[PDB]
Symmetry: C3
Subunit: 631 residues, 3 copies
Amino acid sequence: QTHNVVHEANGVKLRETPKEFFERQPNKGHIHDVNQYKQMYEQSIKDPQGFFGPLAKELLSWDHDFHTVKSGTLKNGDAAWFLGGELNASYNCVDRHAFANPDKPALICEADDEKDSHILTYGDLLREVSKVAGVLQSWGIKKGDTVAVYLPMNAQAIIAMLAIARLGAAHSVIFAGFSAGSIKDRVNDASCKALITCDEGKRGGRTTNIKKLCDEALVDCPTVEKVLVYKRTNNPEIHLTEGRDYYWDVETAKFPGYLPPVSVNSEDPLFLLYTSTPKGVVHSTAGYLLGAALSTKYIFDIHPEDILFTAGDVGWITGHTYALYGPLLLGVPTIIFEGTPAYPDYGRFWQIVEKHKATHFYVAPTALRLLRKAGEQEIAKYDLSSLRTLGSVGEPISPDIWEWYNEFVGKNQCHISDTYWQTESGSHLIAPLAGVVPNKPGSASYPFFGIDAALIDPVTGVEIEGNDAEGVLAIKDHWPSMARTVYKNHTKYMDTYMNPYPGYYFTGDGAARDHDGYYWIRGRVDDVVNVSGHRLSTAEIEAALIEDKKVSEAAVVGIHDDITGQAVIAYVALEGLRKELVLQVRKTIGPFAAPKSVIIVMRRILRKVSSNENPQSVEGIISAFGAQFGK
Amino acid sequence: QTHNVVHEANGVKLRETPKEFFERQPNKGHIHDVNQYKQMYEQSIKDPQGFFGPLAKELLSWDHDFHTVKSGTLKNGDAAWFLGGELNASYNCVDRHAFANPDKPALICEADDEKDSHILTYGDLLREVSKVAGVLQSWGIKKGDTVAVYLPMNAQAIIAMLAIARLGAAHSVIFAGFSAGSIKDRVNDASCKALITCDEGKRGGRTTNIKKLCDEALVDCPTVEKVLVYKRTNNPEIHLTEGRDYYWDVETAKFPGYLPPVSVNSEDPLFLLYTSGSTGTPKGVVHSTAGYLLGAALSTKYIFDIHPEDILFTAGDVGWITGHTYALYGPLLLGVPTIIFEGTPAYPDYGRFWQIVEKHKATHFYVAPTALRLLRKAGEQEIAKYDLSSLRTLGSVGEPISPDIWEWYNEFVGKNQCHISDTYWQTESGSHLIAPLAGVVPNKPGSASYPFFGIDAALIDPVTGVEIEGNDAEGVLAIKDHWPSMARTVYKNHTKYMDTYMNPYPGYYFTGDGAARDHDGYYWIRGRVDDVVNVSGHRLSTAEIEAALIEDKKVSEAAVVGIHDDITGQAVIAYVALKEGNSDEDSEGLRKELVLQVRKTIGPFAAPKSVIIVQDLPKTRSGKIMRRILRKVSSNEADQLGDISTLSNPQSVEGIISAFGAQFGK
Amino acid sequence: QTHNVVHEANGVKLRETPKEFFERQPNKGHIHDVNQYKQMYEQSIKDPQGFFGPLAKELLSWDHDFHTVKSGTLKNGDAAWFLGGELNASYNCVDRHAFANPDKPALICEADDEKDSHILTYGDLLREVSKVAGVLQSWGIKKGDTVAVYLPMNAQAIIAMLAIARLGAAHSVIFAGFSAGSIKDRVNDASCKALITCDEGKRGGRTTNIKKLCDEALVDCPTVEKVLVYKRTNNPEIHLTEGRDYYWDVETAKFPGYLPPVSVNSEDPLFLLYTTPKGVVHSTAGYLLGAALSTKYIFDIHPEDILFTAGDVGWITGHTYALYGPLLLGVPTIIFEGTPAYPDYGRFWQIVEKHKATHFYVAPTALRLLRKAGEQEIAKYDLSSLRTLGSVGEPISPDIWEWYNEFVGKNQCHISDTYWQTESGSHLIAPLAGVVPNKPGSASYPFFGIDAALIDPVTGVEIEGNDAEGVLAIKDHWPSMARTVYKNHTKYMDTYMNPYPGYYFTGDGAARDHDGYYWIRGRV
Ligand SMILES: CC(C)OP(=O)(O)OC[C@H]1O[C@@H](n2cnc3c(N)ncnc32)[C@H](O)[C@@H]1O
Ligand SMILES: CC(C)OP(=O)(O)OC[C@H]1O[C@@H](n2cnc3c(N)ncnc32)[C@H](O)[C@@H]1O
Ligand SMILES: CC(C)OP(=O)(O)OC[C@H]1O[C@@H](n2cnc3c(N)ncnc32)[C@H](O)[C@@H]1O
Ligand SMILES: [Cl-]
Ligand SMILES: [Cl-]
Ligand SMILES: [Cl-]
Ligand SMILES: [Cl-]
Ligand SMILES: [Cl-]
Ligand code: NA
Ligand code: NA
C-alpha cells in the first residue's frame, strides 16, 4: 500500500468512472472491464500477429491484402507492419463513409468569427478532396512527392492533407504560426514540389500575414513549382506571382467531384511532420492509421453516434491523429476550431460544445490553465451535459488541475483520459481507457495495446523489475504507428531512439510505476550520450571544464561514431592545456567520461562542425576545429 | 387511343419484328420478349447495384474487382461507377479474344479503293497495338497523358486508339475532315504530347492532304513532342520535320508484338472527344473507362442483338462518337468482327455499302439518315444487284428518321424482313439512351421507343421546370439519374460541364433535346431546344461559324442560323453585313469567298448552304442580334415575326426578307 | 548400335551417377529416374499450360495471379508467359526467405584476399538491398528506368542488381573488365539514369582502375544523372565529381532497413545484358521461373545445399546461377571476387572445404588452368561435401571430363555439362543430377520446354530420325527465352527467328545419337 519510490501514488484513491458516463454512452462499451482489457493487452504483446491482424482487417479497408503482420526490430530500425498491403488514407477517412451515409457530418468547422462557421458532410468532403487532388494531379504531383501545407486550423487544411494523401504523396503540414525562416527550413529539407496556403488568416480577430511569409520563404525554396492559395480574407492587395501562384477557388472549379484514390503500400510514407534542427518525423500509412483508429476507438470510447472536439492544430501531431485521421477513420464528425479559446470571449470552447452537442473533448493543460485563470465563470453558462470523455494531452496534468477539469468542466460526471504519447509514437502510448480504467489524478495508468512499456536504469540500461520503481521510460518492441525514420536522415533517427538504450525505444522521458502498475510521467531526462556503453552528460562535462580557472566558456556536444556509437567533442574558449583539461574531466566525473577530443577555439552549429559538415563567431569554430582536431 | 399532344403517334400501327429475323438469329435471343425487357429495365432503375453489378462482372474482364457499383448524383456532377475497379480497354477489346481465338477476324477493313482492302485478326491486332504502344511508351507517353489522332477511318485509326488506351493514356481523335485551325484548338486544349497521323488520305478516289494540315497546325502546338506518321500513300514528297516526325513502319519495327497492358481505374479517363455546342469554343467531352465500356458492350449486345457469330458494319467514322462506340469499342468488346470503311457511299458507285455487306455477309448495318436520303435519291437501282439476306438488324443514328425513310430503309434494304433500330443518343451519353431492342420491341416508324437499361427518361415543362407526369405529353427531354457511360466532365473545365448539363434543370441531366411521350410510353424525338445545328450528321456550332466569318476583315457582323434541308437534314444559313462593301457585281464572288473562309477555318463540312449579304442585322435596344428574326425569315415564316417595334433598327427587317428572297436561290 | 554420323558416340559407355551422390543427397531426389523425367518432359512440350502453370505457382510468389500461361510464336516474335501476373524479383530472392529464416546465410562472400571475406544472411541482405533501393528511389529511379552496374564479383554487385529490381527498374550489368569505350556504348544504348560502381577493385592482389574507367566513359553519357560509388579500397586520391558522384556508405546511412518492393508485370524487363553490342532483354516471370527450375532439377538443389558458381555477374552465368537461381530457392550462394590462382591454385578448393559447398559450377577454361598448374593442390583440401559438378560455356573434351570427374569429384559426383546461351536465360540441354546417365562430351537430353531439333542447313528442313547433324534449333519458345534486343526488335528477329522461320536459331551445330543425346559441335 505504501510507496518508497513513487511518492505521487501514496494516499491516492482510485476514481471509478461516474455512472453518468454509461448513461450517456450510446452503445455497450467496447471493453467490459479491466480484466478484459488485460487479457487483450497481454495478447497484443505476446501475439501481435494474432491480435493486430484481425483488427487491421476490421478497422481499415484494403486494396491489397497484407501477407505479414509484423517485421523488423528496434535494434535494426527496420520496423514494418502489414507488408504487402495496399490502401489509401483518404479512402478510409472519406470515400467509404460518404458512400454509406453521404449526409453525415464530417468537418464541423468553427471559424475565428462564428459568422464564418460551416459544416461539411462526408459527401461534401469527398468532392472537395477530389477537386483539390485533381488540381495537384494536373500539376504533376504523384506518389513519392512531398507537398507543404501552411494553413490555419480550418477545413482547407484538412482538405489539403487528405487530397495530398489521395494521390499517394506525403503532406508536410507547417504550423501557420511559423516564421518565414521556419517555413524555408522545412520546405527545403523535404524538397516540396508544391505548397498549399491562403492569402491571410484570422486569429482572435486579428489578421495574420500567411501568404506574405510564404513569399518571403519561397525566394529560397527552388523545389516549389506551384502554390495553391485560398481566399480566406479575399484581400485584393495580396500579390500572386504569375506562373507560380494559383487560386484555390479558380482551379478547383475546373475539376470533378470524384477522383480515383491512388493505392499506396502499407509502408509508403503518409506524411512528414517536422519537430521543434527540425527533423522530419516520418509515419507509415497502414500502421499509423491503425494506431489512430485503435486509440481513438478504445481510449476515448468513440462510437458512430459520437462527436469529437480536439482543441488542437494540424500543425502538430495532436491535430494529425485526433482532429483528422482518428475520428474520420471511424466515420464520426470532428470539430475543427480555427480561433483562440478567448475570442470573441472566454466561453468559446463551451459555446462550441453546447452548439454541436460534442461528446468528447480533448485539450492541453496549457489551455485549461488559461481558462481557469481568466474565464472560469463562463463554463457554468453553457450546457455541457453531452460530454462524457475529457482528454488531456502534451504535458503533465497536476492533481489540482485534474480536479478542476473534472469538476468545472465534467461536473464530476465524465471520465478523464490523461494521454501520454509523442510525435514519434503516432498515437497514444499510456492512457486510461474511457469507461474501463479507474483513474489516479496525474497518472496516465496502463500502457496501451502493442506498447510493452518498461523502466530502464539510466546508467546501466537494464530493465527495472517490480513496482514502486522509477527510471527511464522505454518500450521493448516497436508498434504499428511508430515513426519509421527521419526524412533522409535515418542515422539521426537511430541515434535518437534506438541506439541510446539498445534493444529499447527511448522516449526521452522518465517515469514511475506504482504497486498497481500505473505509470506516472516524471518529465524529460538529462540528455545522456552513449560512448561505448558509458552514458555521459554533456552538461556535466561542461561544468568540469569551466572549473579550470584558465577556461572562460565551454561547450560539449555529441556526434555519431561508427565505432563507439557516439563521440563527445568539447569546445573551450579561454597542446599541454588540452591534455590538462581531459585529465580534469577524468578526476571530476570519471575515467570513461573524458571527451574524445578537446578543441580550444548554439550547440546546433557545433554538432555539424564536429562531423565535417553574434553571427561573426561561426568563422572561428570552423577554422579552429579544422586545425587542431588531428590526434 | 387518341393523342391530343403527340400527333406523331395518331393512327400508327405497331410493326412487329419479322419472323425471318428469328430464322437468321444464330442463338436464342438475349431477351425473351418485351415483358422480360420491362422487368429488367425497372430493375436497372430501382436497383442499379443488383442489375449492373452482375452485368459488369459478365461482360468486362477486371484486373481488380470493384467494391461499389454506383456513386454520386447529377446535381453535384460527381457520378462514378464500379469504384475501386481496375481494367484496361485494349485488354477487353483485343487480348482476351486473341487468346481465345487468335485467327478470328477483328477489323474487316474496306479501303477507299477495294484493291487495298484487308482483314486483321484479333491476333494480328494484338501485335500491331503492342508495337505502336511500344513506340509511344519509349516516347514517354504514360498514364494521364493525352495523345491526338488525325487519321482516316481505317485500321491505323483503331490501332492508334487501342495502343494509346493500352498505356493508360486517353486518346483525342480529331476527325480527318477538320482544318488545321480545328486541329490546333483540340491539341492545345488537351496539351497532347504526341500525335498519330498519316502522310495523305484517299476518299472517293481523290487524294486528301492529311500530314500537310498537321504541319500547319503544329506550328502553334508547343506541347506536341513527337509525331508518328503512317505511309498511307508513301508519297515521297511529303516532308517530315527532323527530330519530331517519325514513320509508323520504321519505329514499330523496333518493338515486339506483345506489350503488357497498363491497369487503370474504372474512373480514369479513356478518351476526350471534342464537341460543338452553344458557345463557339469546342469542349472536350471526357469519358471514363469501365462505365463507358460497359455501356458500349451492353447496348451493342442488347439493342442490336449481337452474338459471337455476327458481323457488324457501322457506316461511321471514329472522328465522331458513333465510330468510337459502335465501330470500335462495342463490337470489339463483344469479340465480333467490325467493318472499318475508309471510303464514301458513292465510290466507285452508289452500291458500295451493299457490295461490302454482301462480300462479308454482314448481319448488322448501322447508318445515318443522311446517307439513306442520298442512296434513295441517287442509288436505289443499285440495291437489286446485291444479296443482302445476311442482314437482320438495320440501325439508324444521329438524326430524325422520317416515316418515309423508315419505310424505304425497311423495304429496299431490309426487304421487310429485318428489325430496325432508330437509336437516340448523343456524344455525352456514351451509348444508346432510347432505342428499339432488336427482336424484342415493336416499332413505330419515327419513334425511338423505350429508354434503355439505366436510363430513367422524363419530360420537363419548359415554362415551370417541373417534370410532367403521365403520357400524351411533350417537353424538354431529361434523364433523372446518371448512367454508366455518361460523360464525366469537360476537360479541365468542369464548370462548363455543370452549367451545360446539370444546372439548367437541377436534379436532371439536360439532353438539349425536346421530345414527346405517347400513350404507350414510346418517345418521339423532336430536335434540339438549344439551337445546335446538325448538318449531315455533323454537330455544328452556329457561333463557331460566325467566328470564322468574322475573321475575314471584310466582314463587320455575322449571324448564323439553321433551317431544314431535304438533303442534309439541317442547313446553315449565314447572314453577313460588310463594312463599306456594295459592289453588286462582286457579290457572287464575295459570297463564295466567305464560304471558303468557313472551310479553311473549321472544315469543308461546316460550310454554310448559303451566304446572305445584308446591310445590317436586326438588333435589340442594347445592341444585340435578334437571331429569332433570322430563323423565321430563313424558314419562309416572315409573316410570323410579330411586333418588331422593340428592335433598335426595325427598318432592317424589310431588308433581311428581301435579301434572303433574292440570294438564297442564286 | 553404331553411328555413321555422330562419330563422337561410337563406343561410349554410359556413366551412371555414383552411389555417393545419393548418400550425400539431403532429401529424396526431385525426379526418380530417366523414365520419370521423360514423362515430365513430354508434358512440358505437349502441354506447356498444364506443366508450367503449377510450377510457376509452386516456385514463385505472386502479387497478382496470371490468367494465361503461354502466348505468342517464334515466327512473330511475340512470346509471353504468365500474362497478367505481377511479382518482384527481389521479393522472391530476398524478402520471402528473410521472413522465414532471417539468419540463414545468403551471400557467402569470398573476397580477393580471404581476410576481407564475410557472410550476409537473408535478413542482412534485405536491409542492405532496402537501403540501396531507398537511395535509388530518392534519386528518381522508378519502374521503367535502366540502371547500369560496373562492379566486381562481390556483395555490392548482387545488392545493386537486387536493389534496382526492387524498384521495378532494369539493371544492365557491365563486366568490370570492360574498357571505357565498352562502358560508353552500353550505357548510351540503354540510356541509364544512374550508375553503381566502386572506387577500385582487387583481383589476384592487383588493384584495378574501376572508377577511373567510369569517369572516362561518363563524359559521353549524358543520361547518367548520379553515380553511387562504393569504397572497396577507400583510396583518398579517387576523384568524385561534385554533384554527380556519391558514396555508397554515406547515402545508405540515410535510409531505413526496409523499403517496400514494387510490383512489375510478368513481361516487364528484369534486365538488359549486352553481348555492335546488343542489349539482350529478359522478362521477369519467365526468366525467374527458368532459373529456379533448372537450378532445382539440373543441379538437384535442396534447401540444405550450398551452391558455388565460379562465374561473374558480368555474364549470364552469374545472373542465372550465381544470383537468381540459388536465391530464389533460398539456399546460400558463394560469391568469389578473386581468381583461382591467388593466393595459390588451391583457392577454389579451400573455399569448397571452408563452407562445405555441395555444388560447384565452373567453365572448362578454369579446368584446363588447374589441370595444367594446380593438380597437386586438390589433395590438400576436403571436397567430400560436393555431389554435383557443373560445366558451362565451352565444349568439354572427354579428357577434361575424366580429369574433372576423378581429381575434383573423386569419381563420386555427378557432372552436368550444361549447354545454353545468354538469350536462353537458363539451361537448354543438360544432364540432370542423379537422373540422366552421362556420356563424356555430351549435354544429353533437352530440358523442360526445350523441344530441340536439327535442321539441314542446305535444305533448311528439320532432320527426322537419329544419328544426325545440322544446325541446332528449338521448335517453340520457352519461359526464360530472351524477348527482344533493346529498342531493336528487327535485329532480334533477323538473328534468332528469321533464319529458319518457325524455329529458334541457336547459331550452333549439334549432333543427336541413337539414344537422343545431343553433342554440341560448335558455332556455324
Ligand atoms: C502529444 C504531443 C503534442 O507531444 P510532442 O509535441 O511530441 O511532445 C511529446 C512530449 O510531451 C510530453 N508529454 C506528452 N504527453 C504527456 C502526458 N500525458 N503527461 C506528461 N508529459 C506528457 C513528454 O515529454 C513527451 O515526450
Ligand atoms: C448520336 C451522335 C452522333 O450524336 P451527336 O453528334 O453527339 O448529336 C446528338 C444529337 O443528335 C440528335 N439525334 C441523335 N439521335 C437521334 C435520333 N434517333 N432521332 C432524332 N434526333 C437524334 C439529337 O439532337 C441529339 O441531341
Ligand atoms: C553459357 C553462356 C555464358 O554462354 P554465352 O556466353 O551466351 O555463349 C553461348 C555459346 O557458348 C557455347 N556453349 C555454351 N555452353 C556450351 C556447352 N555446354 N557445350 C558446348 N558449347 C557450349 C555455344 O557456342 C553457345 O551458343
Ligand atoms: Cl526481418
Ligand atoms: Cl587520452
Ligand atoms: Cl455520394
Ligand atoms: Cl497470340
Ligand atoms: Cl565491346
Ligand atoms: Na495495380
Ligand atoms: Na493487384
